[PDB]
A paper describes a structure:
The highly immunogenic third variable loop (V3) of the HIV-1 envelope protein (Env) is a plausible target of such efforts, but glycosylation at two or more V3-loop positions in the native trimer has limited the scope of previous work. We describe here a high-resolution crystal structure of “Man9-V3” bound with the single chain variable fragment (scFv) of the N332-glycan dependent bnAb, DH270.6. We have also determined a structure of the Fab of a clonally related member of this lineage, DH270.3 (11.8% mutated nucleotides and 42% neutralization breadth), in complex with a synthetic Man9 glycan. The mutated residues anchor DH270 lineage members onto the V3 loop GDIR region and contact the high mannose moiety of the N332 glycan.
Antibody DH270.3, in a different branch of the lineage than DH270.6, is both less potent against autologous and heterologous viruses and has a narrower neutralization spectrum. In any case, the DH270.3-Man9 structure confirms the contacts we observed between DH270.6 and the N332-glycan, and shows a conserved mode of glycan recognition by these clonally related antibodies. The one notable difference between the two structures is at D115H. DH270.6 has threonine instead of arginine at position 98H. The mutation allowed the conserved residue D115 in the antibody heavy chain to interact favorably with the C-mannose moiety in the D1 arm of N332-Man9, while R98H and L48L, found in the UCA, DH270.3, and several early intermediates, anchor D115H in a rotamer that does not allow the glycan contact.
Author numbering:
A (entry chain L): 2 to 213
B (entry chain H): 1 to 141, 148 to 230
């Protein structure tokens, strides 16, 4: 078998939200052994609820579990921006095994936009001594996770050897990205300045470096 | 505290076998069940097994029954998982997690109550050969940011620390970029007080386990 959850769920601060987990009678229906886990991007899951309605350590009353027939339910009240995470249901089976749900990506609304912090790094002397050059553009602390990057040699746009990561959620519910302009030492020195520009909803923030 | 520490990342070609160890501390392994699960990157959780360290008894879903071998070494407080017939579908992060209390009178084996997890072990299966990374210092630009550039490596992941774990505050390791060449590169910055430059020694400790590459890089201000 497999447990079934809503693939994604959107909520908004203050008001409640409810994730469902629909199983069979041979697992969710035959045991009071339903557990809910919360996962942030880079971390291992964290036990929220266990045995249908019991709280794990470090869990507020905001989280509450329940069961009706073959369907478990995870209710969250007084929503916060930190609750933005993936939620998994899980149950024991009659086969003495453990079954998991596909996971529910919860999205808390009303999050204030955040300006991208850009830090630009010129090629190190060492890397240049390895006969290659790489400009490193590091973007952080932005929201929503939609960003644009434009590289600039002197004053002409560059699209050759760019490679940009897709934005990924940090700990603080904000996003991070990076771009890597890869060029040759000769190209690095054949210009007076290079510039990494970042567009984040209308507004842009850019940094510059120069070989001298 | 109660802690589970798993073995380093691994790169395996299809058809081969992998063995992940999970090392317990802060409690006795044989007092609780050990569960093993995995998570294909960007996908969901998949429970693979439970084991009783005292009896040796194991259970796994039908999907893994022939391929998986769970064992323990209580003398070292270690749990082991061997996965065989490795396929591209098997590339995932593997977690061991501590289960319920092992009791003579009650059966907690299948209780899905994991109150302690291991950090995870990324095992990737592919025909591509491992590539160690090249590490370069990113010289410091009342605070400043200095960093480390980790370039051209395969597979994921690399682990970056600073001052051999002594520096923990202000560190930001960015997610790696997959270049068209099929390789990975990432960066890791520290934001330190500008005053501390020139007297405090900053070193990034980069480790790429699949290629067994351990590089310590002293990052120091530009030659000015």
């Amino acid at each position: 078998p497999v447990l079934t959850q809503p693939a994604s769920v959107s909520g908004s601060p203050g008001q409640s939200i409810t994730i469902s987990c629909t199983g069979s009678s041979s697992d969710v229906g035959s045991y009071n052994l339903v557990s809910w886990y919360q996962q942030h991007p880079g971390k291992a899951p964290k036990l929220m609820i266990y045995e249908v309605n019991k709280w794990a350590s470090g869990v507020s009353d905001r989280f509450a579990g329940s069961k009706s027939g073959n369907t478990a339910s995870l209710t969250i009240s007084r929503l916060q921006a930190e609750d933005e995470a993936n939620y998994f249901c899980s149950s024991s089976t009659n086969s003495a095994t453990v079954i998991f749900g596909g996971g529910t990506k919860l999205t808390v609304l009303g999050q204030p936009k955040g300006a991208p912090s850009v830090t630009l790094f010129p090629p190190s002397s060492e890397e240049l001594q390895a006969n290659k050059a790489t400009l490193v553009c590091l973007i952080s602390d932005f929201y929503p996770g939609a960003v644009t990057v434009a590289w600039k040699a002197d004053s002409s746009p560059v699209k050759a050897g760019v490679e940009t990561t897709t934005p990924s959620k940090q700990s603080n519910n904000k996003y991070a990205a990076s771009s890597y302009l890869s060029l040759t030492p000769e190209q690095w020195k054949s210009h007076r300045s290079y510039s990494c520009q970042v567009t984040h909803e209308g507004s842009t923030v850019e940094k510059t470096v120069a070989p001298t | 505290q109660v802690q589970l520490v798993q073995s380093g990342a691994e790169l395996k070609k299809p058809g081969a076998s992998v063995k992940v160890s999970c090392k317990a501390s802060g409690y006795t392994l044989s007092d609780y069940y050990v569960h093993w699960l995995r998570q294909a990157p960007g996908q969901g959780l998949e429970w693979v097994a439970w084991i009783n360290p005292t009896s040796g008894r194991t259970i796994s879903p039908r999907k893994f029954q022939g391929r998986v071998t769970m064992t323990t070494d209580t003398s070292m407080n270690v749990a082991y998982m061997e996965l065989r017939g490795l396929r591209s579908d098997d590339t995932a992060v593997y977690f061991c997690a501590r289960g319920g209390w092992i009791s003579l009178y009650v059966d907690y084996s299948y209780y899905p109550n994991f109150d302690s997890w291991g950090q995870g072990t990324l095992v990737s299966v592919s025909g591509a050969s491992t590539k160690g990374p090249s590490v370069f210092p990113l010289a410091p630009s009342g605070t400043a940011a200095l960093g480390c550039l980790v370039k051209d490596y395969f597979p994921e992941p690399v682990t970056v620390s600073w001052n051999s774990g002594a520096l923990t505050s202000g560190v930001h390791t960015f997610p790696a970029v997959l270049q068209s060449s099929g390789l990975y590169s990432l960066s890791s910055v520290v934001t330190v007080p500008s005053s501390s430059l020139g007297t405090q020694t900053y070193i990034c400790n980069v480790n790429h386990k699949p290629s067994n590459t351990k590089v310590d890089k002293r990052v120091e201000p530009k030659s000015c």
